[PDB]
Amino acid sequence: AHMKGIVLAGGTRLYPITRAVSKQLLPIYDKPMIYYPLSVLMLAGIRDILIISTPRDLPLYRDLLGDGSQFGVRFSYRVQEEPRGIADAFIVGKDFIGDSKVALVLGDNVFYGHRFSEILRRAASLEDGAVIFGYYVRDPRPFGVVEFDSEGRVISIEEKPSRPKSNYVVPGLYFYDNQVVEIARRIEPSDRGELEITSVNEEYLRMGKLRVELMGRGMAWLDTGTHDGLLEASSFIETIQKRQGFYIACLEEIAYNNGWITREDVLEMAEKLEKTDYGKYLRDLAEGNFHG
Amino acid sequence: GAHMKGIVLAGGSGTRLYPITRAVSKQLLPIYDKPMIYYPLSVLMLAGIRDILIISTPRDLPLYRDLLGDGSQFGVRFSYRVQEEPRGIADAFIVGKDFIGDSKVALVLGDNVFYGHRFSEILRRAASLEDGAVIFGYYVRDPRPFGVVEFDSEGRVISIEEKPSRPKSNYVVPGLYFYDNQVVEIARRIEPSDRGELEITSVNEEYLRMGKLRVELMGRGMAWLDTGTHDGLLEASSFIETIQKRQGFYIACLEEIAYNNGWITREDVLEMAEKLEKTDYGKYLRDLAEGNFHG
Amino acid sequence: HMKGIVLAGGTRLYPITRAVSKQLLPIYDKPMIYYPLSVLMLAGIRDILIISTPRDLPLYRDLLGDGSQFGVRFSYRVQEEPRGIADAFIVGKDFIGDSKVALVLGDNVFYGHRFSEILRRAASLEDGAVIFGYYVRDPRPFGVVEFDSEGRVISIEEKPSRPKSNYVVPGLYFYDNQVVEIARRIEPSDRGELEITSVNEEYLRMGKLRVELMGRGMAWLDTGTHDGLLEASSFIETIQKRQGFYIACLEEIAYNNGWITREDVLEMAEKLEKTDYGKYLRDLAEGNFHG
Amino acid sequence: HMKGIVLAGGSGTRLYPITRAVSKQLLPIYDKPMIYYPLSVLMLAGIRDILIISTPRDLPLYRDLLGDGSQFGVRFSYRVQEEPRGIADAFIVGKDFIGDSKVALVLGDNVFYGHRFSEILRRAASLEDGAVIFGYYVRDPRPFGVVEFDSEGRVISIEEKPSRPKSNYVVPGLYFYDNQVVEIARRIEPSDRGELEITSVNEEYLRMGKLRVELMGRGMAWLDTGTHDGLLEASSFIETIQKRQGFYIACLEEIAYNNGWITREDVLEMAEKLEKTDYGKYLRDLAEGNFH
């Protein structure tokens, strides 16, 4: 029952800031990077989530996230001894997934936009097959490009085409029915030796069971892979938080508004963080922010 | 009299931005790579409005005409009128009475910058009003610094309160308003406020008491940038820079909107790109004409 | 007394420059031209000529007026068309008279510790000229200056593929009265341009060209691209917040130079009450504790 | 030879949640870990024997980043500080490391930058006796410890957050001491909050007429790494300087190389390993001469 979630947070162009700090624990303004893809799983209604990372960093992810009870969710943890490809998430997470459907998001993917929740909730309601995303961009060549028909059925996915068949690119967010476990087990490793998520998606494509949800004009997919990208991403979140006033990926807020934790739960977390900005945000959340 | 017209109010400001507005009209200040006024202009164009009146001070009007010309480059018509005295936002309908004629009209403040996914559908809906007025409510966590709009679940407006200590909603009123033709006579009848201005809030309050004021909400994820402080302008520029670098499309490239609306031709776009060949903006136009693959 | 000239006339920034002069664009909280003007004032110069295009010159007049608000004097002269940087000495001949004169480009924004000391020294020249050398890792995109240990300039090349030094020449120059005649005599370029490089070469080949270095730690911002302007504004915002002092607040420079009175400052702050810039002026008159 | 200590341990929760799983001094400042900045200051002062103090949980991460120091021609030693017992505790934890040497102490979260800063550091590092602290010029000194001094640099008083400041110069976390500092630290009394305060140490030197201050005037920068907005602005500041002047701030390999502590080949080997990264390309350009 209930669709599960996996955040792939292991895995450098960011040297030396990633020499001793996991990329997905780097800050995006005022919160660790991983809070952002975690908020996406939570906004999609997922409460049973698996965190995957390296042997050095997984204990740190536990230090940050704990058992998930503070957010009314359950967090589990599994190590990925080596970065064997994105599809390896379904090998490492086989037991965790069980017979459930599952959403996979990359721990370094940061998205933001108006009317994003309705798209996530729809993707989370898939009955069978798989659902991937298509982010609209002016120059899609640096990415995996997803081509689809006028109804959302995917027809092709090409890696860095010099002649793109569409202007929609594939970010690291995927929703799957329970078939992905075995599909992942049977796919063939690349020549370089790695289980590619594209191979898993090509399989669903081949079966006419791959649909795409679009993140159109006005949606933002930030660049957390370069130093200028991270600075820009932090500046962007700071601006949005200041002008609209609400935090982006405050997991306590999402949990509370989803009814997964109580007002008293929020009050108590705020009390433990009294002299901090984050704590005052939680206190206001509990007080109601006027009309909410 | 046939099509809804538009007015961009781009006149006098206080000295809050002094000294950068001492010699540069606020609405000509840059927001990253384009003059501030391109942003609200893009909103009128996205709403389908092609007959637009630019109102500014006697000193600045010529500079706006230098920038915008007669509008033919964007497939629109620009008219210009001077606001001799800084009389208030509602004065736009007095200064613009002849331009408006018997048409419905949308007014946008020249310093208002909005952005968000699925904003066009909200604009086209507002532009389709049959009667009364349509204003906007921008969602914020702390609405106290603004005008606050209270409304029911169908968008009917109940009240508008300025800087309330006890806000009745978390939605604030920005500088974008759509009106039927009664707005001209309503503006002629409001009383100046205690601060000596013909307030747009007085116009909206008259539509409210007529039972004809509606509001369209701009929810979480939409951006209404701050162009009124130095820090706000800097943040606004950074926000535009990010969206443009990350998604690749420009925000408020008027040529782009005109072209995709069918208002100018591919040849028109190519010719503008040619006059600006060695510039970033020029290259964007060149790419637009080529199709940006499958843009 | 040494005079000063700010060249602010003159596409890459289209469309923000279509109806707004580049040098009036903001750098965080002040018009771009305030930054090079503050350099002339920190060097002690009180008689300044502003040069711009026919279209933009009135806007500079609107901003700066006669200069009395800063205890200086501003004069204005039009440049019908961008005929070259050295043309400032043609257009400015009458303004210059028989005085020594410093020329700064209206789009040049500099910032760094111990900058006033080198401005004052350059402004104290007895004869010849003084230009600057800005330390950079890749000097290829600029005019590259080579000098000896006495600060004597020996060479200047334009965008060399094999630079002879890591110091580049920004738009800031100090000259003795000889520059007018020199600018009158230099030979135009293939594009009918009166290059400032031709002028500097003349002093070079006389052994009368000295250089002041803007070393590691000094910043010369990029005001010529959209990303550069955004970065420049961010930089000024950070420094003003962290050290607390404004960069290129002309009233402050005037008041501390004794060119205007505390009352003058309070008057300006009065007119700008409720504003950030106004409160800064109020504090300046109140003393900022020890100043 | 004068030794150095970087105190990079426990912090408060002000930056929560970005410091929950990442030590504050490993957080990025644009393209390098925060600790590189104060480390660069010790190296520009000519110090090659450096002690890194941190919490038991984070010390291994600092060692992952820094190693034994040989890559920079320096020697890094590591000592634990179970809890932030006070800044002056650095001399108790580091007593054996210090031995009979003079020593410089810098806080791992202090980031300074400015034209002609090296000459100031070299002067402080050359003290014959007593102590040398710093005074950073600000328009409003009230939020800090304020240092009052005379024209030859003698310190008259240091007051914490005075409503009526005796100067516009504030005290940052950078201090140079003769060998008497260990005994002085041993004799100070714990403060009201149960901490061994560095201000107590400086006051002892002050009262003996043996405390001097070096000023960091207008044009010098002391960045704010204590708030989210401060970190964002600090990153933007480094990005600006690096893009506009071309040289990096706190590239330790560069400082080591120019000090003659490592060879051109050492730099080139590190650059080749990082050739696909911007940091690696900077090292290559430095060692291929950067023209001059």
Ligand SMILES: Cc1cn([C@H]2C[C@H](O)[C@@H](COP(=O)(O)OP(=O)(O)O)O2)c(=O)[nH]c1=O
């Ligand atoms: C390939 C791979 C990636 N990852 C993580 C690192 C990133 O958060 C994300 C995708 O990484 P990757 O595909 O290497 O590229 P990028 O860093 O540009 O996103 O998944 C793992 O945890 N394990 C793996 O085996």
Ligand SMILES: Cc1cn([C@H]2C[C@H](O)[C@@H](COP(=O)(O)OP(=O)(O)O)O2)c(=O)[nH]c1=O
């Ligand atoms: C509700 C909510 C949204 N968000 C993000 C998700 C989107 O990127 C953006 C907009 O939220 P979204 O839920 O899409 O709201 P709406 O349907 O009204 O537009 O904000 C948070 O980070 N936290 C929250 O608590």
Ligand SMILES: Cc1cn([C@H]2C[C@H](O)[C@@H](COP(=O)(O)OP(=O)(O)O)O2)c(=O)[nH]c1=O
């Ligand atoms: C009051 C008023 C405003 N305006 C313009 C200036 C701005 O573009 C816009 C709104 O100005 P204003 O109401 O002063 O507020 P704000 O500066 O916070 O936006 O309307 C005029 O052109 N004329 C007027 O008489």
Ligand SMILES: Cc1cn([C@H]2C[C@H](O)[C@@H](COP(=O)(O)OP(=O)(O)O)O2)c(=O)[nH]c1=O
């Ligand atoms: C189409 C288009 C939109 N925009 C702005 C308007 C909105 O703020 C945002 C999103 O566009 P919008 O038209 O709402 O499109 P969609 O329904 O696909 O999201 O981009 C431009 O600036 N230029 C354009 O050419």
Ligand SMILES: Cc1cn([C@H]2C[C@H](O)[C@@H](COP(=O)(O)OP(=O)(O)O)O2)c(=O)[nH]c1=O
């Ligand atoms: C060449 C030239 C420059 N200028 C001004 C414009 C700039 O502020 C400065 C330098 O111009 P220029 O070097 O042409 O461009 P940039 O600095 O943008 O790379 O001098 C004039 O006013 N007239 C001229 O004829």
Ligand SMILES: Cc1cn([C@H]2C[C@H](O)[C@@H](COP(=O)(O)OP(=O)(O)O)O2)c(=O)[nH]c1=O
């Ligand atoms: C004194 C002063 C300096 N500055 C600038 C000039 C330099 O770029 C920087 C540092 O000032 P500077 O006078 O060089 O200080 P110091 O001699 O103490 O090192 O600040 C202003 O903008 N305004 C001022 O009032």
Ligand SMILES: Cc1cn([C@H]2C[C@H](O)[C@@H](COP(=O)(O)OP(=O)(O)O)O2)c(=O)[nH]c1=O
């Ligand atoms: C007091 C104290 C600080 N520190 C470190 C943490 C910071 O890098 C630095 C200064 O800490 P602190 O004085 O708490 O203030 P701040 O964090 O606002 O700068 O010293 C320790 O490692 N141990 C200690 O006992």
Ligand SMILES: Cc1cn([C@H]2C[C@H](O)[C@@H](COP(=O)(O)OP(=O)(O)O)O2)c(=O)[nH]c1=O
């Ligand atoms: C030489 C050098 C300086 N710096 C810093 C120290 C100062 O904050 C600033 C300027 O350097 P500094 O050595 O003070 O040089 P100068 O005396 O020529 O001004 O740059 C580095 O980060 N790395 C280096 O390799």
Ligand SMILES: [Cl-]
């Ligand atoms: Cl894929």
Ligand SMILES: [Cl-]
């Ligand atoms: Cl209420």
Ligand SMILES: [Cl-]
């Ligand atoms: Cl209103």
Ligand SMILES: [Cl-]
């Ligand atoms: Cl030259």
Ligand SMILES: [Cl-]
């Ligand atoms: Cl102290």
